Amino acid sequence: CDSDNKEYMGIEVYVEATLDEPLRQTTCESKIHKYGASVSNGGLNISVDLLNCFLNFHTVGVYTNRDTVYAKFASLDPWTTEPINSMTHDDLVKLTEECIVDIYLKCEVDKTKDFMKTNGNRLKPRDFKTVPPSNVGSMIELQSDYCVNDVTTYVKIYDECGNIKQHSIPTLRDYFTTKNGQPRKILKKKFDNC
């Protein structure tokens, strides 16, 4: 955080997708690649590519409940995790103006897996928390697929040196949902590892 001038940013991308049948029990598989990541879980492959963002994900968590798959792509401690999410100031300017979080859903419902067992609902309304509104329009681009009834997505890109440097980079937020008349909420429960 010692203006090289390098900037250090973090990123969280949340994807929630409700499918058209109750979920089948699957084995989770995730892959992090250069400026993106993907996860195959619950009958859906969710892929996130970061276009002109100059940022890498470090972790993918998942959740599955009823008919809904959740994924959280995130960065971790930025000074101890490889690859380091640092960038020049000119690259941060381009991130600010041009970063797109390109989300792609692919249905992969597998009839060789039985339906998830369901006792009592493992999620409850007070597991979802409101998030602030978008401050960057059209940062999220989403492609859905036929088996998906609704998708919700949220991105937060933030300064890791904000508390610290003497100045801070504005947090960039966007939110997109196919749902109508629903509050701006995301699952805040701790996700499972993939």
Residue numbers in the entry: 6 to 199
The authors write:
The A41 protein from VACV strain WR is a secreted 30 kDa glycoprotein and very similar proteins are expressed by camelpox virus, CPXV and all 16 strains of VACV tested. A41 is secreted from infected cells and has a primary amino acid sequence related to the vCCI family of poxvirus proteins that bind chemokines. Collectively these data show that A41 binds a subset of CC chemokines (CCL21, CCL25, CCL26 and CCL28) via a site that overlaps their GAG-binding site, but A41 does not inhibit leukocyte chemotaxis.
To understand the structural basis of the action of A41, its crystal structure was determined using protein expressed in E. coli and refolded from inclusion bodies. Phase determination was accomplished by MAD analysis of Seleno-methione (SeMet)-labelled crystals. Electron density was observed for residues 26–219 (numbering for mature protein begins at one) and the structure was refined to 1.9 Å (final R = 20.4 and Rfree = 25.2). A41 is a single domain protein with the distinctive β sandwich fold seen in the vCCI class of poxvirus chemokine binding proteins. Sheet I is largely buried from solvent by two long enveloping loops on one side and sheet II on the other (the other face of sheet II is exposed to solvent). One of these loops (the 9–11 loop, residues 113–144) wraps around the molecule and connects β strands 9 and 11, whilst the second comprises the C terminus and packs tightly against the face of sheet I, and bears strands 14 and 15. Eight cysteine residues in A41 form four disulphide bridges (C6-C166, C33-C199, C58-C104, and C112-C152). Despite sharing only 19% sequence identity with CPXV and ECTV vCCI, the structure of A41 is strikingly similar to the poxvirus vCCI family of secreted chemokine binding proteins. The surface charge properties of A41 are broadly similar to those seen in other poxvirus vCCI proteins, although sheet I exhibits a large patch of positive charge whereas in CPXV vCCI sheet I is comparatively uncharged. The absence of the 2–4 loop in A41 may explain the specificity of A41 for certain CC chemokines and underlies the weakness of the interaction.
